[PDB]
Amino acid sequence: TRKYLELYIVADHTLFLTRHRNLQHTKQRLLEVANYVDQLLRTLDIQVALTGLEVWTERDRSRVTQDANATLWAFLQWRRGLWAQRPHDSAQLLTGRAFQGATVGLAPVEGMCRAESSGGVSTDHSELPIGAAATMAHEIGHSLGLSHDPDGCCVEAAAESGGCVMAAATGHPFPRVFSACSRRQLRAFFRKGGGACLSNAPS
């Protein structure tokens, strides 16, 4: 019984523009962010399989604004049509837009595999790909029913180590591991029936 996450990642038009309208380099950024997401999720014993990749080179397919929540749900609605053509477990939007309130990412809680909510949004806020990846892994965490780490969690992964992924705030150094509290919450989530779509090994 092994767990696999079929991930579909999207780069919005703004990100494309910040990447000098360079398709190849925008795709490379997505690939490197996806690689770090895989590294982080593997500390939960979940392997990531990059199912698909998309760059909105001419226009955003869903409305992206300063409102993180509005952006998240507009993306999720668009994701429904995407899913019908390109099946995946979770779709993640990586945006070059900055959200109001210093928010860098959002995702519906316990929505993994749900038709209306299996996705998330993250701003590419750091020069380092691991920044966006830690945010994306955090949103995927919420999708898997993980809550923010209580202060008595993340016994170790010291300050200089970046801490743990489910921390409520982010910043360099970025987290590379999920806390033991997160591990326990994930196992309970799976036992209770959540994330049923993570059971298949990608073809």
Ligand SMILES: *[C@@H]1O[C@H](CO)[C@@H](O[C@@H]2O[C@H](CO)[C@@H](O[C@@H]3O[C@H](CO[C@H]4O[C@H](CO)[C@@H](O)[C@H](O)[C@@H]4O)[C@@H](O)[C@H](O[C@H]4O[C@H](CO)[C@@H](O)[C@H](O)[C@@H]4O)[C@@H]3O)[C@H](O)[C@H]2NC(C)=O)[C@H](O)[C@H]1NC(C)=O
């Ligand atoms: C993040 O952003 C999302 C999207 O904007 C918010 O989700 C919306 O939340 C509101 C309130 O919770 C929901 O409003 C309900 O809409 C129902 C009809 O929905 C249709 O129309 C909306 C708007 O055009 C579309 O988004 C949607 O796809 C549907 O086509 C109404 O029937 C509801 O009214 C009835 O129920 C309410 C509450 O139960 C009663 O008080 C009323 O008397 C009435 O009987 C209600 O107006 C809306 O549907 C949600 N949109 C979704 C699911 O996409 C999040 O709340 C927001 N998160 C935040 C800010 O925390």
Ligand SMILES: CNC(=O)[C@@H](NC(=O)[C@H](CC(C)C)[C@H](O)C(=O)NO)C(C)(C)C
């Ligand atoms: C640099 N900005 C931040 O640290 C913000 N935090 C976020 O944006 C969170 C995501 C980070 C990946 C931890 C977000 O609120 C969340 O929990 N989504 O699930 C602050 C603390 C300013 C609100």
Ligand SMILES: [Ca+2]
């Ligand atoms: Ca799957």
Ligand SMILES: [Cl-]
């Ligand atoms: Cl168990």
Ligand SMILES: [Cl-]
């Ligand atoms: Cl049980």
Ligand SMILES: [Zn+2]
């Ligand atoms: Zn959070």
